Design a protein around this ligand. Structure first.
Ligand SMILES: Nc1nc2c(ncn2[C@@H]2O[C@H](COP(=O)(O)OP(=O)(O)OP(=O)(O)O)[C@@H](O)[C@H]2O)c(=O)[nH]1
Ligand SMILES: [Mg+2]
Ligand SMILES: [Mg+2]
Ligand SMILES: [Mg+2]
Ligand SMILES: [Mg+2]
Ligand SMILES: [Mg+2]
Ligand SMILES: [Mg+2]
Ligand SMILES: [Mg+2]
Ligand SMILES: [Mg+2]
Ligand SMILES: [Mg+2]
Ligand SMILES: [Mg+2]
Ligand SMILES: [Mg+2]
Ligand SMILES: [Mg+2]
Ligand SMILES: [Mg+2]
Ligand SMILES: [Mg+2]
Lengths: 84, 140, 41, 55, 120, 94, 95
RNA sequence: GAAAUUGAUGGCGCAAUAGAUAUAGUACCGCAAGGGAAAGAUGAAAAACCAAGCAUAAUAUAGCAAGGACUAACCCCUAUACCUUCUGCAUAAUGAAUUAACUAGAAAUAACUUUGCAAGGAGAGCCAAAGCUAAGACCCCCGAAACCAGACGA
RNA sequence: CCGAGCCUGGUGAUAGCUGGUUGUCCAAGAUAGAAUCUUAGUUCAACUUUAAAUUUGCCCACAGAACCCUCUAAAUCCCCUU
RNA sequence: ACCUCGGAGCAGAACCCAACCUCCGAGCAGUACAUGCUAAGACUUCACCAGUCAAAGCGAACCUCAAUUGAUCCA
């Protein structure tokens, strides 16, 4: 029943993101945390790359908009300057 | 005959050992044993997908049996357990049905409870208070 | 030299230690097996 | 015909050629044969440089 | 002959009814698309295969973030029948370098910058 | 009795095929997804003029990296240590 | 051609290639255009000028001619006054 | 396809389907020319466990004969032999009873890789505007009806 | 076993034709046509493989690519950005 | 019956496209005698062969045509 999970905002697959999978599978009886699971490390790396790309794309689009605004300015005050 | 093969006995045996449990000459003659053994190995490789599929089918059948014993249908039980947010898989559900009948009865009662809560919500559609079990724990 | 010191450290050079310089002897391709057999190219 | 620290020779060649080429040249240090191979033609420049070094 | 399809421009002109239905204001449009390949490129033209490869949607059900700019939109229009496009939402804003390692893309399309895996 | 001439699904006289409610629902679901795709593509963020050249620097740097990788292809180094290590094959005890 | 001659065991040269083509030491093969002496009365002056020219060959044609001629024909020839002396080497050629 | 000219002590072999055809040109076959085999294994002295095929031990519903399995051989579920050829073969297209043995990729040009030397290389000759020298590494098996020469045959 | 005997030899005749072409493992890999006594084949293209050098390759914004013809298609070419 | 070449549809719009598909044609003729010589850069009948256009320059004056043809050797 993935549609209900999607409606609730969880992953359609319970094996996706969530405590059931992203939490450590085990820990030492003494209480010491276990070394990170290989799948969890790979997933964290993938999410980090995704977030970095999100930031890069947003920054590039913002910089492009700012550059376009600056170019429109340059054009406007130029036009005015050689009009005067 | 400068160079001659001296291991042909062992090369043949490497296949005849896997062919020993066949029928007829397929377990004795290499010309036949090799073909039969290749087919057997291909079947063994392809049989893992079928093993998983048949395991899931058997689990679904047993869960259906237990749910019918308790008056529920398998789709209702599975969907309502998911809605209750109990993520027991089909293997574990069948194991509980076989070996923990009282626990499976409790799970079926929970599934029917959630099903009736959903029916009540649909019937009295609106902003009526959410069902007690219908409430979903939120993780962040 | 460091190479000669390494020789001093290493076992004796004999006819059981000789090896051609890697890349000097290309493997010989002959028509036996699945990949190079059948129609043999 | 290189004798000694072929790796030091490689470092010196890279330092000498990077300004000319614009980027660090790609090279192979054949330690066994005592030779240094550099991608691109630099025979005249390297000959003059080695003459300056005094070899 | 079967050829590349030119989608008329009126198809991609949203109406107020569409805005109400899909919850997106024409002003202040979303910056980034989350695109997931939900359809196989097999049995589809080589140009659609190439566009999918260009967009980096080779793996199905693997979200990819893309700019909401006219050229990327043109490619997405070319391969729109094989992909699901949603707007990337940033409830807590863009992730910072401090929280870059704690992000998660929820199924709703929100890139939460804190992922504690704990009950609310 | 009840033969389909020749091969099913290809000839002039093909075996009839009928759409089930399941198939209709699947196609409708896909159509809904594509309609939402149309909606979300109908709202560009920047215009073509605004986007012009906003990623040129990054694209050029990426291609420069590709060119550097292509032009750095050159045979690997060779080491006297690697050559002499083969003498160890006859390493023995005393 | 004859890959191994019955008397010497050597590779032989197809003398038609020698009679028809010129090899420049750089690896280029020069040839005359076919029909440059045929039916000139019906050919326009531009066509005659094109046909009266010495012409190079494809890479594949050059390779074929190299295969069909032995190494003796690919040597460096220091003839006294060779009209093609300057054409035996390439200059300012990149790749 | 020249010539002038130049100068010049055994086995990284086979070991009885191999190596000679050969234990023998014998047996056998053919009027004749001619064709042409097979094989043997003790010991210092004889004056001393393994191929196929079967038997031990015929067979039980169902099916490319197996696989997943299973407490359990079978029963359950899945599974349209192989090779070649072809657009496409379970194909009712070819080959194959089966075991053992034998049975089929030879090499120049030009390049590539690795050494050596280097405006020179090579142990005369040859090549050379970084080349030359050395090595490595690519080129199958069986099959016609035929043609011609000389013998042998009424 | 005579449309022209048989044997030996040239002879391992030749066959664009059929058949066969024997260890393991990984990887890339199905692409227009032209000529040919040629369409059962081959050579060149195209595709494909390997290695090497270099820098642009694909997608593609406007603008642009004919009248004949009264109307006249899906499209295409070119093509910065991305 | 056909075999080579050109034009038009099929093939409506860059190019290219089969057919023992539909239709037309060609195997010249005319004029000129610089219808001479050279030479950048391009096109190209999907290869090659072959076939095309052509700036500038010299020398002068002050080609039409869709096809209208055929290599090598040898004479
Ligand atoms: N290569 C080779 N060497 C042989 C052969 N037969 C004999 N020899 C050599 O002849 C040499 C002398 O042979 P022996 O039998 O010792 O003496 P021998 O009888 O006086 O020799 P011969 O005069 O050769 O008959 C040895 O070096 C043998 O190896 C042969 O067939 N080939
Ligand atoms: Mg293969
Ligand atoms: Mg039928
Ligand atoms: Mg002589
Ligand atoms: Mg014998
Ligand atoms: Mg036995
Ligand atoms: Mg049968
Ligand atoms: Mg059969
Ligand atoms: Mg047949
Ligand atoms: Mg039979
Ligand atoms: Mg008589
Ligand atoms: Mg007779
Ligand atoms: Mg033969
Ligand atoms: Mg592969
Ligand atoms: Mg062309």
């Amino acid at each position: 029943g993935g549609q209900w999970r999607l409606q609730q905002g969880l992953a359609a697959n319970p094996s996706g993101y969530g405590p059931l999978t992203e939490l450590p599978d085990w820990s030492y009886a003494d209480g010491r945390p276990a070394p990170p699971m290989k799948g969890q490390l790979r997933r964290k790396a993938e999410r980090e790359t995704f977030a970095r790309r999100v930031v890069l794309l947003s920054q590039e689009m913002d910089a492009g908009l700012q550059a376009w605004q600056l170019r429109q300015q340059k054009l406007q005050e130029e036009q005015r300057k050689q009009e005067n | 005959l400068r160079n001659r093969v001296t291991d042909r006995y062992f090369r043949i045996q490497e296949v005849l050992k896997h062919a020993r449990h066949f029928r007829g000459r397929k377990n004795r003659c290499y010309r036949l044993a090799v073909r039969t053994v290749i087919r057997a190995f291909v079947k063994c490789t392809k049989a893992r997908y079928l093993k998983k599929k048949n395991m899931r089918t058997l689990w679904i059948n047993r869960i259906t049996a237990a749910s019918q014993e308790h008056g529920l249908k398998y789709p209702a039980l599975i969907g309502n357990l998911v809605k209750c947010q109990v993520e027991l898989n089909r293997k574990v559900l069948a194991d509980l049905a076989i070996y923990e009948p009282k626990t499976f009865k409790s799970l079926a009662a929970l599934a029917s409870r959630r099903r009736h809560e959903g029916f009540a919500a649909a019937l009295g559609d609106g902003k009526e208070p959410e069902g007690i079990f219908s409430r979903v724990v939120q993780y962040h | 030299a460091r190479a000669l010191d390494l020789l001093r450290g290493l076992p004796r050079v004999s006819l059981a230690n000789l090896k051609p310089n890697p890349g000097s002897k290309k493997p010989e391709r002959r028509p036996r097996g699945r990949r190079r057999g059948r129609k043999c190219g | 015909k290189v004798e000694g620290d072929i790796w030091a020779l490689q470092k010196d060649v890279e330092d000498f050629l990077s300004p000319l080429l614009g980027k660090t040249p790609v090279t192979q240090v054949n330690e066994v044969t005592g030779t240094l191979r550099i991608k691109g033609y630099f025979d005249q420049e390297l000959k003059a440089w080695l003459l300056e070094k005094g070899f | 002959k079967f050829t590349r399809s030119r989608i008329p421009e009126k198809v991609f002109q949203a109406s107020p009814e569409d805005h109400e239905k899909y919850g997106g204001d024409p002003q202040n449009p979303h910056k980034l698309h989350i695109v997931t390949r939900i359809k196989s490129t097999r049995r589809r033209p080589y140009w659609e295969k190439d566009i999918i490869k260009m967009l980096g949607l080779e793996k199905a059900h693997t979200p990819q973030v893309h700019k909401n700019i006219p050229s990327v939109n043109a490619k997405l229009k070319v391969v729109k029948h094989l992909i699901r496009i949603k707007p990337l939402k940033l409830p807590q804003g863009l992730p910072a370098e401090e929280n870059m390692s704690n992000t998660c893309l929820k199924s709703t399309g929100e890139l939460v910058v804190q992922w504690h895996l704990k009950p609310v | 009795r009840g033969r389909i001439p020749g091969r099913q699904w290809i000839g002039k006289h093909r075996r009839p095929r009928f759409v089930s409610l399941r198939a209709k629902q699947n196609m409708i679901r896909r159509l809904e997804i594509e309609a939402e795709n149309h909606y979300w593509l109908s709202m560009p963020y920047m215009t073509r003029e605004q986007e012009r050249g906003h990623a040129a620097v990054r694209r050029r740097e990426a291609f420069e990296a590709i060119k550097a990788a292509a032009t750095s292809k050159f045979p690997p180094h060779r080491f006297i240590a690697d050559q002499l290590d083969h003498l160890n094959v006859t390493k023995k005890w005393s | 051609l004859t890959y191994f001659s019955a008397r010497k065991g050597k590779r032989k040269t197809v003398k038609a290639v020698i009679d028809r083509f010129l090899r420049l030491h750089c690896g280029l093969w020069v040839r005359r255009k076919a029909g440059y002496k045929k039916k000139l009365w019906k050919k326009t002056p531009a066509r005659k000028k094109r046909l009266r020219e010495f012409v190079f060959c494809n890479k594949t044609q050059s390779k074929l001619l190299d295969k069909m001629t032995t190494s003796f024909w690919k040597r460096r020839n220091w003839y006294v006054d060779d009209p093609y002396q300057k054409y035996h080497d390439r200059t300012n050629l990149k790749v």
